[PDB]
Design a protein around this motif. Structure first.
Motif, PDB file in Angstrom:
ATOM      1  N   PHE A  28       0.830  -1.201   0.000  1.00 10.35           N
ATOM      2  CA  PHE A  28       0.000   0.000   0.000  1.00 10.35           C
ATOM      3  C   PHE A  28       0.868   1.255   0.000  1.00 10.35           C
ATOM      4  O   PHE A  28       1.909   1.303   0.654  1.00 10.35           O
ATOM      5  N   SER A  29       0.433   2.272  -0.735  1.00  5.24           N
ATOM      6  CA  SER A  29       1.182   3.521  -0.806  1.00  5.24           C
ATOM      7  C   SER A  29       0.791   4.450   0.338  1.00  5.24           C
ATOM      8  O   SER A  29      -0.375   4.817   0.481  1.00  5.24           O
ATOM      9  N   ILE A  30       1.773   4.827   1.154  1.00  6.73           N
ATOM     10  CA  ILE A  30       1.518   5.713   2.282  1.00  6.73           C
ATOM     11  C   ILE A  30       1.998   7.125   1.973  1.00  6.73           C
ATOM     12  O   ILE A  30       3.184   7.348   1.695  1.00  6.73           O
ATOM     13  N   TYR A  31       1.068   8.078   2.017  1.00  7.02           N
ATOM     14  CA  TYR A  31       1.401   9.468   1.729  1.00  7.02           C
ATOM     15  C   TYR A  31       1.422  10.294   3.010  1.00  7.02           C
ATOM     16  O   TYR A  31       0.704   9.993   3.965  1.00  7.02           O
ATOM     17  N   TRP A  32       2.249  11.333   3.027  1.00  5.17           N
ATOM     18  CA  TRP A  32       2.351  12.184   4.202  1.00  5.17           C
ATOM     19  C   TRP A  32       1.004  12.823   4.522  1.00  5.17           C
ATOM     20  O   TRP A  32       0.365  13.416   3.653  1.00  5.17           O
ATOM     21  N   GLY A  33       0.575  12.691   5.777  1.00  4.01           N
ATOM     22  CA  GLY A  33      -0.702  13.254   6.203  1.00  4.01           C
ATOM     23  C   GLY A  33      -1.856  12.391   5.730  1.00  4.01           C
ATOM     24  O   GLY A  33      -1.708  11.598   4.800  1.00  4.01           O
TER      25      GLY A  33
END
Length: 147
Positions: A28-33
């Motif tokens: 899964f792609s984790i983005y800031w915030g």
């Protein structure tokens, strides 16, 4: 006054780290915030004066939603592990305990003097917005890699 845009420094809504699951072989792609206002993104990292990213001992909080059931059986277990990629470095986490808390549980969104990964999600179709009780997956860092 939003004509100008920035893309290079840690900014909310930007891919900073990637979440990989070995047991469930899921990524899964984790983005800031984690902006809940917009459904554009899928998974975001909690950002606060207490919450930080997993770059070396810190409180890591993950935010996501539940859609359907597939590997949820393997997701909730102490045998499962969560691998986080940050700065070309891979962090190995392990599920310690799984429980459910309120969306107003700051105790799970506070600061951690250690590398702990906490995942909070839920947002069920039945409830609109931030569900009352969010699922919490607690995990600790057991191993780390760097290339």
């Amino acid at each position: 006054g939003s004509h100008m845009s920035s893309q290079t420094e840690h900014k909310e809504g930007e891919k900073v780290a990637m979440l990989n699951i070995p047991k469930l072989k899921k990524k899964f792609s984790i983005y800031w915030g984690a902006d809940d206002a917009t459904l554009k993104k899928g998974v975001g990292m909690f950002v606060s004066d207490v919450t930080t990213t997993p770059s070396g001992g810190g409180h890591t909080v993950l935010s996501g939603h539940r859609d359907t059931v597939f590997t949820d059986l393997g997701q909730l277990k102490e045998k499962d592990t969560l691998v986080l990629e940050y700065d070309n470095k891979t962090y190995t986490y392990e599920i310690q305990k799984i429980w459910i808390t309120h969306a107003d549980d700051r105790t799970v969104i506070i600061k951690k003097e250690e590398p702990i990964l906490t995942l909070t999600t839920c947002y069920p179709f039945d409830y609109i917005g931030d569900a009352p009780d969010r699922y919490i997956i607690e995990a600790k860092l057991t191993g780390s890699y760097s290339k």
